[PDB]
Design a protein around this nucleic acid. Sequence first.
DNA 1: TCGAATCCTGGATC
DNA 2: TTTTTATCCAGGATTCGA
Length: 1118
Amino acid sequence: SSVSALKRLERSQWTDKMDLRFGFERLKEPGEKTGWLINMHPTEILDEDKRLGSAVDYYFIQDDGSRFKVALPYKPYFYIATRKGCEREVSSFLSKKFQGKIAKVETVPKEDLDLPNHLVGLKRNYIRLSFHTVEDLVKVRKEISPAVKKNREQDDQLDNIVDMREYDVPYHIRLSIDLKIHVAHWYNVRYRGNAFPVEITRRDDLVERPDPVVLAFAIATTKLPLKFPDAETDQIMMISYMIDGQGYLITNREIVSEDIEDFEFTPKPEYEGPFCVFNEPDEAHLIQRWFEHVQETKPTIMVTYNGDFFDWPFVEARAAVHGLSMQQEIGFQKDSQGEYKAPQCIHMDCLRWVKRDSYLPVGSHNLKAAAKAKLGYDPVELDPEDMCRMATEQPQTLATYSVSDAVATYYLYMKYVHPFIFALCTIIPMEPDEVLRKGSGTLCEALLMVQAFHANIIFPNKQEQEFNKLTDDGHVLDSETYVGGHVEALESGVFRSDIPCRFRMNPAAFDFLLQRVEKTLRHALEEEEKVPVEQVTNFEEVCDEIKSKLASLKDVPSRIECPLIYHLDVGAMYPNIILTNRLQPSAMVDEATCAACDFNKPGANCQRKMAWQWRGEFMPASRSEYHRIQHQLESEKFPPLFPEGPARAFHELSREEQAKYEKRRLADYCRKAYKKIHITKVEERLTTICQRENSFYVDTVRAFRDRRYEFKGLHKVWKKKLSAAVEVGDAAEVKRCKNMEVLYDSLQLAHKCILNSFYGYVMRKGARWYSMEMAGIVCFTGANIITQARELIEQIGRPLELDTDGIWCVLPNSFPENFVFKTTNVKKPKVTISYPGAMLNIMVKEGFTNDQYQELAEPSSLTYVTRSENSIFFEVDGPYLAMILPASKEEGKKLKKRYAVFNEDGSLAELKGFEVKRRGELQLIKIFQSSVFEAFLKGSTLEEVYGSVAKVADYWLDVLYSKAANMPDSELFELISENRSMSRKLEDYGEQKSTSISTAKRLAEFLGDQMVKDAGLSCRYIISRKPEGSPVTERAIPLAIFQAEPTVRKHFLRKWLKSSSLQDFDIRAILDWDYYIERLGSAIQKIITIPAALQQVKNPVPRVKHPDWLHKKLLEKN
DNA sequence: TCGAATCCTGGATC
DNA sequence: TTTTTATCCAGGATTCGA
Ligand code: SF4
């Protein structure tokens, strides 16, 4: 006991000293106060017996920047269930044995959705156990749970208990759920004295957020030449930081040759960047002064970029060299999770947001690229290798650089991150840094728990996962999965609204549309616009012009016309389908309940049936073979966990070991025993959805959708008011309006993110509310919608690109496009409607709409209303100027999500899948693709378009023929060199074989083992001519030898090229030019020639030849 | 002797 | 206590059978 008590109370007292040093005082005496809740953490406090008690600390900040704490007790608890009539016996035992280890037990009725026939109104009983402290709960939990499983397998005083629930919610989550306490609101707090718990209440009459002091910093480090730094060998060079927009810098005079002068730096006029600099003689004075000043300002938030990895451990180690205890002086320490934390201030790292919520591509997550995109300017570089000489020769250029990593970090954190995470906190019972670090599945689950609690619903336990489950015929299932969505590119080449194209349109489709024009328009006016057709005056005329143009299309169906390009898509399709079908994780059933439900009367209508496709993957062996495979294991013996241990029999293994060994044994047996190792089989299934079941989930999604659209509207209102304030030019009014705009947009983005999270959660294996069926039906209905949206277009025109949620298509110029209706309504005098939308939304409304939606009218009545609903609608983007798609070089393949698209201004509108997003495999390919995409815009006929695109191919092919004979001498290297890197150590690869490995060995044979020892080896390398016919993984040369010393260069080349007979060793002679030509000739062949061949023009590039099958088909034409 | 299929690592995917 | 991983692509080597 004593060690535990003194350990926890001592660390508590130290934390109290630490946060008292930063000015957080515990609320000392009875009183009443208000503030903004900035953080909370669990801690123990003593009771009136001086026993331990679990509690939570709340940290508050006031308007004036004063700060205080409160501590708050709450007894945790969990539920258990029992057999018929057992609760008096069970409670008698449980109270007697654990006396003084549990606080309270009671019987409570609960709503439980798995109980048969429960819609009649029944609800079941549970016993609640509650404990003085969490450790006593953990001990009783571990004594209890062994008794449960055997009882479930059977389907006496302890053994009768049957089940347990909610035993694993985190205690701070439990309290924050239960008392409705959420960060980022103002609160009134009252302390009466120890006779009463402290009382907290939210107040809604306050809005504007307070202004926390936040700090951002960066560090710069000495290193040995061609070495990474290490904390023993290398001193600090610079540490630079911002607080309250003021900058500060310190730099080590051990390497800096003279004292630095202060200066002002400014990326843009809005970025004030004043700095102050101290010069002191050594690194110990640097670190001491840094702590001495940081202890002055006492910030609340600290931010760094990937700072858990590089920035903190470095200074922690350098602090250790001088014996400075940062964990006492600052109070930062590394948690069991592996990440830095402190009891009193929050460490926010921008990268976890950039990785999760920015939608930047992998290439762009460099700090300087992220700054360039988000802030609109580039911080200019200095290489770390240069710092030592710059600090010798001209240090103030390095000082000028050292601002660029700080200021961009601070402004990125403030503008994008800071308004957002605090907004997302307001709706979820989690801490800001937990909400940043945790994944969106957990974020959703912590939300749904709140609704399940307030509806008094007992949670389900986590979905424990089975292994080696058997198909009914006996086959061992290796996976299950629903058939996903299907993406296909139907067509290839160039479309431009400036040049004609050939259309052949079915003559019945324009009659089928013309028969229903009034239907197509009435629905779009009444339902979408919400103006009754009574109130529109010109409605008869627009119908006449529609009918007459459609008839004119009927008269001449096959024609040449300039194209219209349109993008059609469905706004948040998956939420809308969930709402429309009433899909809920629990709402699925099978007849085993409907056989026993008192609502299953003749003429009941609560059953909705739907279909989905299941894709079994399973091994070929039969059940009777599997039983023999099992029984053969019942005499096998297995190794211990470590060489000293005894051998284990197969029943002494863990279940993952058992499954792994059975899978290995059966796969090995099957490879001989059967012709094919495993099988896949698509099979489609019906599933009932019970329509009457409790609505809480779908109501939650509905609420989030509507709140999102409210906040969108208020955002636009405030943005307009901000524009007015900007034109008025009152700085206080501009500030107020901008702060409103920032808050409202931040809430809009939070709501969007949470709403999108609701679909993906049910994918999370193990998750509390998990089902496969709903994730099947929600896909297969989307594939139905997007198939029928294709059929009707293929008759009118031609689709070009399907998608997960939209279509790109081309339509004839003579199509009706857009119209305006004239209306008497005060709110809406003129209204614009687009025909392509109203053409489809009727079809969707007719086919998909649901006629079985029911709702409970009055809880005591058992009366339900029957209703119909539909939220599924199409919308339209465009038209556009040009659209371009590549083609597969292999005949049978259709690509996915490659194309480009251009606005009518010629500013690029989209570009997807192409390497020009990435670093590219080679700079030559990246630049080529970039130049050709722009070049396609030029010219005015297909022959002219390809004729003037090919002049970009020739300008490069002249290079690879002329061996860079014009290009500056070393500038060849930065064009031709790959800069790839090895992923892992060769000691971590082991048996693997690759180019990067081969060149790593080639580097090792020059450098020795000095570098291959290091992880993540960087490579710069080329392909060498002289080893003619050597297999490609043997070909590489590392660049650096061409820049090393002359005799070394000569000797190692003579070693590598297998010849002494080449006189002049230059990359121009040495490269396998034809390899790079054979690569450019394979990029060009998917963009400029094969697409052109698919549109019946001749090959525009004589220097490149078609693939065999295409040439065969083309000659077969002749 | 040649064609195609499997499996591999590697980056990338929102 | 817990994290996106399956899917897709791209280049590459090795095996199998007419
Ligand atoms: S779907 Fe209707 S009839 Fe079937 S179990 Fe549910 S409530 Fe009863």
